[PDB]
């Protein structure tokens, strides 16, 4: 991946110059927000499975998606969808702790959209499940870290769409 700190360092390096105060303010801001990010990551880690179950119940269960004819029908495909959501939550947590969306563009949105198109996995339903994940984690973590995690979940959502 590619952190916010390393993002500032990379912009400086590509310019070939030292890190000016204008770019050093971004570094200071990221340094300040360490405690919130680490706490949010710990909270999410302690409750990942519960988050996924709650989001699935909110967004997917008792719908045509999970009835016969829906991609979430059958046991194996249900488990595959749950695994996808687990990976999404973990990678969103990674990007939140990093302060950058590069890991999402690198290890999530890399051939995933076209894989889903090939398999006919409904993009809208997946985005809905990610929105439910966002709501559950925000309700579990807080407003500030909730929004700053919803940014990265939204990055994933807009990449899939």
């Amino acid at each position: 991946m590619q952190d916010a700190i390393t993002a500032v360092i990379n912009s400086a390096d590509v310019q070939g110059k030292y890190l000016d105060g204008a770019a050093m303010d971004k570094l200071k801001s990221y340094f300040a927000s360490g405690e919130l990010r680490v706490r949010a990551a710990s909270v999410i880690s302690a409750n990942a499975a519960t988050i996924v179950k709650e989001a699935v119940a909110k967004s997917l269960l008792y719908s045509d998606v999970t009835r016969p004819g829906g991609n979430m029908y059958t046991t194996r495909r249900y488990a595959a969808c749950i695994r996808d959501l687990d990976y999404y939550l973990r990678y969103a947590t990674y990007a939140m702790l990093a302060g950058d969306a590069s890991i999402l563009d690198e290890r999530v949105l890399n051939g995933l959209k076209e894989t889903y198109n090939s398999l006919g996995v409904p993009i809208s339903s997946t985005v809905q499940a990610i929105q439910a994940i966002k709501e559950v984690t925000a309700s579990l973590v807080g407003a500030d870290a909730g929004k700053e995690m919803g940014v990265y979940l939204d990055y994933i959502c807009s990449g899939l769409s």
């Binding site: 700190i5 390393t6 340094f31 360490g34 880690s45």
Partner: protein, 160 residues
């Protein structure tokens, strides 16, 4: 930075980072003020640091500027000064990042391959980095010098 290292280690095992990794992240994210002031202090004093380092090196290796030497000629000499400055910039990058990744990805991997192709002796480069280390640490407080020395040592160890 250490955050990226933690995330890489965690993803390689397909798990959330453990408690210890997050605690290390917290400690690093707290020492940021010292890292930032070290980077700034090294930044504005690039010219003096490079001047002391280069005079020391070319006192150590007069052959480099002597006829037939790699640095003989104003163009080559200026390129060497450019290299001093660039590696000092890399050191500041490493200090801010909290690890050697910005240094290593930019100016250590393949560095022997590059300088061999330019006939700049790698032992000349390690001596250059040593004198740059001495000059730069001379311009820092004792605690800041202790903090920023291991980055110079890492460049030295990689160089040879």
């Amino acid at each position: 930075s250490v955050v990226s290292q933690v995330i890489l280690q965690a993803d390689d095992q397909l798990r959330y980072p453990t408690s210890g990794e997050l605690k290390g992240i917290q400690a690093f994210l707290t020492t940021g003020a010292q890292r930032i002031r070290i980077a700034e202090t090294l930044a504005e004093n690039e010219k003096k640091i490079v001047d002391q380092a280069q005079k020391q090196l070319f006192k150590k290796h007069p052959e480099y500027r002597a006829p037939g030497g790699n640095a003989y000629g104003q163009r080559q000499y200026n390129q060497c000064l450019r290299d001093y400055g660039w590696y000092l910039r890399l050191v500041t990058y490493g200090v801010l990042a909290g690890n050697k990744e910005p240094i290593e990805t930019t100016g250590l991997i393949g560095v022997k391959e590059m300088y061999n192709s330019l006939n700049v002796p790698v032992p000349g480069m390690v001596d250059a980095v040593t004198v740059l280390k001495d000059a730069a640490l001379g311009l820092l407080s004792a605690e800041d010098a202790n903090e920023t020395a291991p980055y110079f040592d890492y460049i030295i160890q990689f160089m040879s």
